[PDB]
Design a protein around this ligand. Structure first.
Ligand SMILES: O=c1ccn([C@H]2C[C@H](O)[C@@H](COP(=O)(O)O)O2)c(=O)[nH]1
Ligand SMILES: O=c1ccn([C@H]2C[C@H](O)[C@@H](COP(=O)(O)O)O2)c(=O)[nH]1
Ligand SMILES: O=c1ccn([C@H]2C[C@H](O)[C@@H](COP(=O)(O)O)O2)c(=O)[nH]1
Lengths: 113, 113, 113
């Protein structure tokens, strides 16, 4: 059970923190959205929220990651929501399949329930 | 006709403001992108823009929300662009199907036309 | 070879900078994700990263742009990752098919490799 602080950036100017699946998973188009396990857990740094986005090299290989919002105070496991677009896609364990982007959480007076 | 200020957050640390459809809508894969009415209108707080994203529980049920950019000064109705991925999806009136994220609008010197 | 500074905003309050394809491209659903050339190159303003998102009018016409992360220091050509959802889509040269959003790049102590 690992916190977001254990994630790494590919390069200094990389916007995203790499996310890997902890399991070998095969996806087919007819399966629809699948939630892939990462072994990485919220919560996020104060005043930030997360966006899970695809890596372009993985998108172009036919695996769509659905953009996912990670709430600031989520303490569960970050999962990647993914779908094989046209073809059979195989994710090997430890392959980098998504990225976590951190963004400022703007305060508003919207009511909270 | 309701402003974004009438939206609510599920919880204090929730990144997104919940968006519901004002209509019962059935979607099938062959229908392609459909714009669902929300009865909620721009514009956005100063120096912010909006991103419409899916709720993960709804994505995993086979309804894809296409990420949508809400411009700061848009004064029209915020619609959710949505597609049934694989199966027939039914949206009941008032079910929460998307979320609005507010983000800082960065100024640039890019020319404006 | 044109920098992001040559991009234009539709309007002052437009969140996104317009991206056009430099080629006439026809897309069919069975083709899967295609990377469309823009002739526009990184890098991004300091402390920012980019998100490529669809234009709603183009999404509703059946062309899905996969959200793409542009790293701050990417110096290559910005490409639009796109897919025809259900039908045959034709992109004419110079038609605006996506938008670039600029966002703050938050610093973290995540290790960098
Ligand atoms: O791709 C995603 C999207 C969401 N979540 C988790 C974190 C979110 O805080 C929580 C609730 O999801 P949303 O309602 O924010 O979409 O689910 C993920 O693990 N992966
Ligand atoms: O999912 C969306 C995307 C856009 N719009 C509205 C607000 C945007 O300001 C306007 C123009 O769309 P874009 O060009 O920003 O994509 O359409 C929506 O209501 N829902
Ligand atoms: O839609 C996209 C996504 C990415 N890239 C380029 C810029 C990114 O910095 C680089 C690496 O992609 P990612 O790993 O950030 O997804 O590819 C694009 O040109 N278009």
């Amino acid at each position: 059970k690992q916190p977001i602080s254990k994630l790494t950036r590919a390069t200094p100017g990389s916007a995203g923190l790499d996310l890997c699946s902890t399991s070998h998973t095969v996806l087919t188009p007819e399966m629809g959205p699948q939630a892939l396990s990462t072994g990485i857990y919220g919560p996020l740094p104060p005043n930030t929220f997360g966006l899970i986005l695809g890596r372009s090299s993985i998108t172009m290989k036919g695996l769509q990651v659905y953009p996912g919002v990670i709430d600031n105070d989520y303490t569960g496991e970050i999962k990647i929501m993914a779908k094989a677009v046209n073809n059979i896609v195989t994710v090997s364990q430890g392959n980098r399949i998504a990225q976590l982007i951190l963004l400022p959480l703007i305060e508003t007076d919207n009511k909270v329930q």
